[PDB]
Design a protein around this motif. Structure first.
Motif, PDB file in Angstrom:
ATOM      1  N   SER A  37       0.980  -1.322   0.267  1.00 32.80           N
ATOM      2  CA  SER A  37       0.012   0.024   0.092  1.00 32.80           C
ATOM      3  C   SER A  37       0.787   1.234  -0.051  1.00 32.80           C
ATOM      4  O   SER A  37       0.351   2.316  -0.384  1.00 32.80           O
ATOM      5  N   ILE A  38       1.903   1.269   0.405  1.00 32.68           N
ATOM      6  CA  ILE A  38       2.998   2.077   0.321  1.00 32.68           C
ATOM      7  C   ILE A  38       3.376   2.498  -1.293  1.00 32.68           C
ATOM      8  O   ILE A  38       3.267   1.762  -1.905  1.00 32.68           O
ATOM      9  N   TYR A  39       3.887   3.658  -1.549  1.00 31.49           N
ATOM     10  CA  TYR A  39       3.965   3.914  -2.889  1.00 31.49           C
ATOM     11  C   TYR A  39       5.268   3.672  -3.122  1.00 31.49           C
ATOM     12  O   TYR A  39       6.098   2.851  -2.359  1.00 31.49           O
ATOM     13  N   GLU A  40       6.204   3.903  -4.124  1.00 35.41           N
ATOM     14  CA  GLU A  40       7.513   3.264  -4.470  1.00 35.41           C
ATOM     15  C   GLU A  40       8.477   3.120  -3.368  1.00 35.41           C
ATOM     16  O   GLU A  40       8.534   1.941  -2.651  1.00 35.41           O
ATOM     17  N   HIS A  41       8.829   4.380  -2.876  1.00 27.94           N
ATOM     18  CA  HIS A  41      10.043   4.276  -1.715  1.00 27.94           C
ATOM     19  C   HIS A  41      10.818   3.078  -1.985  1.00 27.94           C
ATOM     20  O   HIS A  41      11.191   2.293  -0.810  1.00 27.94           O
ATOM     21  N   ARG A 229       1.253  10.505  -9.260  1.00 28.49           N
ATOM     22  CA  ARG A 229       1.305   9.146  -9.392  1.00 28.49           C
ATOM     23  C   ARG A 229       0.533   8.708  -7.999  1.00 28.49           C
ATOM     24  O   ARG A 229      -0.054   7.758  -7.927  1.00 28.49           O
ATOM     25  N   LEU A 230       1.072   9.214  -6.939  1.00 27.17           N
ATOM     26  CA  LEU A 230       0.709   8.789  -5.485  1.00 27.17           C
ATOM     27  C   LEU A 230      -0.642   9.059  -5.437  1.00 27.17           C
ATOM     28  O   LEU A 230      -1.425   8.279  -4.952  1.00 27.17           O
ATOM     29  N   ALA A 231      -1.494  10.100  -5.928  1.00 23.74           N
ATOM     30  CA  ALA A 231      -2.973  10.354  -5.726  1.00 23.74           C
ATOM     31  C   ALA A 231      -3.397   9.186  -6.404  1.00 23.74           C
ATOM     32  O   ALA A 231      -4.664   8.858  -6.234  1.00 23.74           O
ATOM     33  N   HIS A 232      -3.012   8.927  -7.652  1.00 22.52           N
ATOM     34  CA  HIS A 232      -3.579   8.298  -8.808  1.00 22.52           C
ATOM     35  C   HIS A 232      -3.732   6.951  -7.894  1.00 22.52           C
ATOM     36  O   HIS A 232      -4.535   5.903  -8.321  1.00 22.52           O
ATOM     37  N   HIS A 233      -2.422   6.454  -7.142  1.00 24.54           N
ATOM     38  CA  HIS A 233      -2.601   5.064  -6.593  1.00 24.54           C
ATOM     39  C   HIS A 233      -3.691   5.225  -5.338  1.00 24.54           C
ATOM     40  O   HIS A 233      -3.989   3.992  -5.204  1.00 24.54           O
ATOM     41  N   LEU A 234      -3.529   6.153  -4.379  1.00 19.96           N
ATOM     42  CA  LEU A 234      -4.306   6.129  -3.372  1.00 19.96           C
ATOM     43  C   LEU A 234      -5.620   6.300  -3.510  1.00 19.96           C
ATOM     44  O   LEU A 234      -6.323   5.499  -2.933  1.00 19.96           O
ATOM     45  N   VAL A 235      -6.214   6.902  -4.711  1.00 17.78           N
ATOM     46  CA  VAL A 235      -7.590   6.789  -4.902  1.00 17.78           C
ATOM     47  C   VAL A 235      -8.105   5.420  -5.058  1.00 17.78           C
ATOM     48  O   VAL A 235      -9.259   4.933  -4.771  1.00 17.78           O
ATOM     49  N   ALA A 236      -7.232   4.739  -5.907  1.00 22.28           N
ATOM     50  CA  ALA A 236      -7.562   3.252  -6.373  1.00 22.28           C
ATOM     51  C   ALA A 236      -8.053   2.308  -4.830  1.00 22.28           C
ATOM     52  O   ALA A 236      -8.666   1.514  -5.316  1.00 22.28           O
ATOM     53  N   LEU A 237      -7.413   2.886  -3.800  1.00 18.93           N
ATOM     54  CA  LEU A 237      -7.810   2.078  -2.768  1.00 18.93           C
ATOM     55  C   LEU A 237      -9.367   2.125  -2.516  1.00 18.93           C
ATOM     56  O   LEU A 237      -9.651   1.403  -1.353  1.00 18.93           O
TER      57      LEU A 237
END
Ligand SMILES: [Zn+2]
Lengths: 329, 609, 232
Positions: A37-41, A229-237
């Motif tokens: 669930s974390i982004y790339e890092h 990219r992070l927002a696009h990932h977080l909304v998906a949840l």
């Protein structure tokens, strides 16, 4: 408790583990399966994966040196919103025998060992704090900055020698533990201002920064691409690898592996410390003391365990040197 | 009507009585007829039978002892009261006790289940408390009251037990008897508490503890802080208030240290030169005659530390110790030297301290941030059982005549560095508290490690500005070793090589002459001389004190922690400690010259841009 | 403590609930009890207890009517209107002029978002709101109103509450010497709303004890009697 139970593995499974351990990137394939669930890092998950294996457990009772720490302490510093406390909250829920502490809600003696007036017998008896109850696992200490310097100078013993020497009213004893801190702090002023020097945004002493060996500076600004990219990932949840591979790969790689150094690896470890000095001397970022040269060992061996290599070679030093260098930038 | 033959007990009593006489040593000469000789002079009442020899002489017996050790103990002691009547000078109502030792197999305080009660086990642990010694009634002689007869030989079981039947057909009080107390049989009784040893602790667990009960001539063998090795039987004990509830208790019979440094049996040059086995004494002599010894103890004590050749020497001279003197008035000169280290980060400070504390026996190790005032020196604790305030010994006391290793000495509080100075000055520890008034001795030598103010050591100021110790304390040390890590590229190769070698050679990379067990022997031997000073050496010493003051003289240079008188009383000490090392009995110029060179390199010159 | 003489100490009574009335009442609760008033068996002075026959919760100031929350079709009339969201907003503390938008947010706080759980990664579904503003703008009126409009609510003042009294405290019993836990404000207000006015004047070491309850919504205690995580 399940080391005798590792011999209770289906031989159908040891094939799976040994074969997964042959793919050219099983490192990046297991790491990238931590906390999906974390982004790339990408690097922080590498460090927190090597922390779940740890260097070898060598037996130094003969040389009279004492004992030798084999677990890895990791520090995470970086400006707010960068998802630090989520990584601690994820690890603490993964590892067994762990704890989660905070800044102001923990005292000097509550972390290591206190002395209580036992109610019935009216006698002073010893008890164990948080850094000793973990003892095999991780002691997540969030809000590392906001602990007055008294209760912060207590970690100096338990996190470097893996011991604790108590001398109070009637109790004169010496505990020990096999914990491994994973701390998270904020820069001073809570804002990473690039005018000051790296040894001034952290504002920690040197006799404490050296007991850590992976100081991850989450330097993250308002990168218009990263934020998107992070927002696009977080909304998906909001609409809607396995575990038992990792949950068993780890038990195996703990039970039947002991990487011993080589002579080709040992000859890349000497220069990797003679350059670190000239580098860290001038910049004023974070000096390097001989203790780091042991950390490389701790890291190098811990990498070999990932691929079940049972022997430390060259690449297992270049990897865990690039990791140690490309975290402070 | 008549009693019943406890056959399994009496047959064992008989065979044990036979074994006591038949078994002989390597040269005939029955051995339990000569150890049982001293058993007649007063205050001795325990014979110590080894258990492995009872295995040689017999084996149908050992399996009866090791399985019924509580049934058949009251008989293995009568079978020692008959075997010792051949002396005729023992008081006829005296009683003896058998004490085994050297059992084959050990156990752990967590393996003491309830399937072990009444058997013969063996336990190892530490020692936490020690209660006082008491008498305990084993067999009372009840003087009857109405008959004026004497009911006799009545056994107590954890209570007073008041036997209530008389052999007189007219006993008006089957509920009243006044027992005498000048014929009854008492035995000493001490009750201590032991705590699970360190090397057995399962990870992530608090150590358990149990009560052991020493009950014989063995009554003050175990003291607090020791690591004895008890061997007795596990018993159950009721709650006598309601005589239920039971609780386990260990009933030890023998107690001995867990690992004897000298395996013979457990105080001047001859008493020790007697116990020296042939190889021991032919090795100690060889060393004492060795030349360049003062360089093969450093190279053999700290084998994994490149450099600082002027610190290992000081540490050695601290280990050997000076000559402790007592002035006729009643005061006393300090005999042992104290040593402090001060340096840059990661310069092998805590490594000297760890080396010293793992090598030396009876030397304690403490940090500074995790200590107290009443924990170092001495405490006062309310024992509500005795409901009294008693004294607890501190780290500066249970390391007596040894070395106390204080790491991070400048992290201690302002008030905790005061109690330590009050001890470092007078070598004693006063206590004046709730109901306690006492003065305790403390002849420890302190090895302390500290850090300069603000990380690095600034070489343009005196010492008093680089460290945050008090003013008095900095005067009571008289040996400083300021270390400075002037990052030398040539060292950063050497240290690297040594560390990687040690980590590639787990148990190797430590080959040195005079193995560590041997140096302990040489150091226990050579620490029993009291070298003297010849007149020429006295002249040399006063001349050196002349040549030291004036270096601090005005004009040309400057130095830190200005030289005073106390540096002189600390030059004779180093020379005496140097003389002890070479096993001599007098000081010579050869010693004082070096003890002056060392104290000369110790003090550095302040600098200025 | 309201219906007590100006500075007198409140008196207690003991209630022996048994049979079927058990598990009705929760601690820290307004209740009304009906039962006989008897003395205790075993000189002539006597200690007395109330022997409960009927227990009714009077939280709402009238009688527990939470279970009787039935909306009629004549009210579905209103709830179906175009701007139902805007009627409620205007009908929150009507005694206060202005503040048309603040009342629009204090309603969202009472309704609350939805909370997810993907791949085992909790996301909270509550909303927190602060009201920084000049003096005399009726903030301690808005809060006092939102206190009474909530099923489970609590009111606390920054200058009259310590950081262990908000979260949870470990306290000893001088009768038994045993340490027990005791919930704070945020625990007693589990599924509801908590209100803290005078929030800039709370001591700085007593304010970081809220960072835990605002994100993970647990309270993790590791003092010397207890080691647990309460749900708040
Ligand atoms: Zn009688």
């Amino acid at each position: 408790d399940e080391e005798a139970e590792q011999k209770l593995f289906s031989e159908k499974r040891v094939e799976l583990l040994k074969e997964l351990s042959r793919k050219p990137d099983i490192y990046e394939r297991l790491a990238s399966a931590l906390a999906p669930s974390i982004y790339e890092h990408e690097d922080i998950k590498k460090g927190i994966l090597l922390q779940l294996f740890g260097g070898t457990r060598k037996d130094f009772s003969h040389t009279g040196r004492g004992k030798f720490r084999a677990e890895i302490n990791i520090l995470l510093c970086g400006d707010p919103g960068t998802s630090k406390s989520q990584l601690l909250q994820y690890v603490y829920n993964l590892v067994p025998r762990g704890q989660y502490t905070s800044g102001k809600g923990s005292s000097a003696v509550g972390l290591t060992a206190y002395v209580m007036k036992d109610p019935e017998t009216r006698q002073l008896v010893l008890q164990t704090g948080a850094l000793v109850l973990s003892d095999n696992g991780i002691c997540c200490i969030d809000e590392f900055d906001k602990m007055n310097e008294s209760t912060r100078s207590v970690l100096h013993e338990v996190m470097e020698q893996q011991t604790l020497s108590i001398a109070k009213a009637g109790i004169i004893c010496q505990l020990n533990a096999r914990t491994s801190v994973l701390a998270a702090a904020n820069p001073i002023e809570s804002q990473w201002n690039p005018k000051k020097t790296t040894i001034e945004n952290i504002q920690l002493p040197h006799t404490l920064l050296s007991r850590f060996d992976l100081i991850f500076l989450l330097l993250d600004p308002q990168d218009e691409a990263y934020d998107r990219r992070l927002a696009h990932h977080l909304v998906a949840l909001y609409y809607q690898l396995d575990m038992a591979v990792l949950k068993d790969y780890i038990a195996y790689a703990h039970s039947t592996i002991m990487p011993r150094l080589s002579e080709e690896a040992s000859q890349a470890l000497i220069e990797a410390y003679v350059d670190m000095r000239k580098i860290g001397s001038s910049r004023g970022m974070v000096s390097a003391y001989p203790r780091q040269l042991e950390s490389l060992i701790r890291l190098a061996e811990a990498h070999a365990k990932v691929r079940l290599s049972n022997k430390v070679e060259a690449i297992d030093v270049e990897e865990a040197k690039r990791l140690h260098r490309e975290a402070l930038k | 009507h008549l009693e019943v033959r406890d056959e399994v007990a009496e047959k064992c009593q008989k065979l044990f009585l036979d074994f006591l006489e038949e078994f002989q040593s390597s040269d005939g000469e029955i051995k339990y007829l000569q150890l049982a000789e001293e058993l007649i002079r007063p205050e001795r009442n325990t014979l110590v039978v080894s258990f492995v020899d009872l295995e040689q002489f017999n084996q149908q017996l050992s399996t009866t002892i090791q399985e019924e050790f509580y049934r058949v103990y009251p008989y293995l002691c009568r079978a020692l009261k008959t075997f010792v009547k051949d002396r005729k000078e023992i008081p006829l109502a005296k009683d003896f006790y058998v004490a085994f030792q050297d059992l084959p197999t050990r156990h752990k305080i967590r393996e003491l289940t309830s399937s072990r009660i009444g058997l013969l086990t063996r336990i190892s642990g530490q020692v936490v408390r020690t209660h006082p010694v008491h008498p305990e009634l084993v067999s009372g002689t009840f003087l009857c009251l109405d008959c004026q007869t004497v009911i006799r030989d009545v056994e107590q079981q954890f209570k007073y037990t008041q036997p209530n039947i008389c052999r007189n057909p007219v006993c008006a009080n089957r509920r009243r008897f006044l027992l005498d107390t000048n014929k009854s049989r008492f035995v000493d009784f001490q009750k201590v508490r032991i705590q699970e040893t360190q090397a057995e602790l399962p990870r992530g667990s608090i150590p358990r503890s149990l009560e052991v009960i020493l009950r014989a001539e063995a009554v003050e063998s175990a003291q607090a802080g020791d690591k004895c090795d008890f061997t007795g039987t596990l018993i159950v004990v009721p709650d006598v208030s309601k005589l239920l509830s039971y609780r386990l208790v260990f009933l030890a019979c023998c107690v001995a240290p867990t690992n004897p440094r000298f395996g013979g049996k457990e105080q001047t040059a001859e008493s020790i030169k007697n116990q020296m086995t042939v190889k021991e004494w032919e090795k100690v002599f060889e060393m004492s005659q060795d030349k360049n010894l003062y360089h093969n103890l450093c190279t053999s004590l700290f084998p994994t530390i490149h450099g600082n050749d002027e610190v290992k020497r000081g540490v050695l001279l601290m280990l050997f110790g000076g000559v402790p003197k007592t002035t006729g008035e009643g005061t006393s000169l300090r005999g042992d030297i104290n040593v402090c280290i001060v340096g840059d980060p990661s310069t092998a400070k805590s490594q000297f301290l760890k080396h010293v504390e793992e090598f030396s026996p009876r030397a304690v190790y403490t940090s500074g941030k995790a200590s107290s005032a009443a924990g170092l020196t001495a405490a006062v604790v309310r024992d509500e059982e005795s409901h009294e305030f008693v004294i607890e010994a501190g780290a500066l006391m249970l390391a007596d005549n040894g070395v106390c290793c204080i790491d991070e000495f400048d992290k201690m509080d302002v008030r905790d560095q005061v109690a330590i100075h009050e001890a470092m000055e007078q070598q004693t520890i006063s206590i004046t508290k709730a109901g306690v008034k006492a003065t305790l001795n403390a002849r420890t030598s302190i090895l302390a490690a500290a850090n300069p103010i603000s990380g690095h050591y600034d070489r343009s100021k005196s010492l008093k500005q680089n460290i945050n110790l008090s003013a008095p304390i900095m005067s009571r040390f008289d040996l400083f070793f300021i270390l400075v890590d002037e990052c030398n590229e040539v060292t950063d190769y050497a240290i690297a090589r040594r560390i990687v070698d040690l980590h590639s050679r787990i148990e190797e990379s430590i080959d040195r002459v005079y193995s560590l067990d041997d140096i302990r022997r040489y150091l226990l031997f050579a620490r029993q001389f009291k070298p003297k000073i010849s007149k020429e050496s006295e002249d040399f010493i006063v001349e050196q004190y002349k040549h030291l003051r004036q270096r601090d003289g005005s004009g040309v240079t400057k130095s830190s922690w200005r030289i005073t008188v106390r540096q002189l009383e600390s030059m004779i000490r180093l020379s005496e400690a140097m003389a002890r090392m070479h096993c001599c009995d007098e000081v010579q110029p050869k010693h004082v010259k070096e003890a002056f060179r060392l104290l000369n390199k110790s003090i550095i010159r302040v600098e200025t841009p | 403590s309201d219906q007590v003489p100006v500075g007198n100490i409140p008196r207690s009574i003991t209630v022996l609930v048994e049979g079927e009335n058990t598990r009705i009442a929760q601690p820290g609760d307004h209740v009304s009890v009906t039962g006989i008033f008897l003395p205790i068996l075993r000189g002539l002075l006597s200690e007395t207890y109330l022997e409960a026959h009927r227990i009714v919760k009077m939280n709402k100031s009238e009688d527990d009517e939470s279970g009787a929350g039935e909306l009629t079709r004549e009210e579905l009339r209103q709830i179906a209107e175009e701007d139902f969201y805007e009627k409620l907003a205007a009908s929150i503390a009507p005694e206060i002029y202005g503040h048309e938008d603040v009342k629009k947010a204090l309603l969202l706080l009472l309704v609350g978002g939805v909370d997810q759980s993907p791949r085992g990664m909790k996301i909270r579904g509550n909303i927190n709101i602060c009201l920084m503003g000049d003096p005399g703008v009726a903030k301690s009126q808005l809060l006092s109103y939102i206190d009474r409009l909530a099923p489970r609510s609590q009111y606390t003042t920054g200058r009259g509450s310590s950081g262990v009294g908000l979260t949870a405290a470990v306290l000893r019993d001088s009768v038994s010497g045993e340490l027990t836990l005791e919930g704070g404000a945020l625990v007693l207000a589990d599924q509801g709303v908590c209100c803290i006015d005078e929030f800039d004047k709370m001591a700085e070491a007593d304010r970081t004890a809220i960072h835990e309850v605002m994100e993970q919504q647990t309270i993790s205690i590791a003092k010397a009697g207890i080691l647990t995580t309460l749900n708040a």
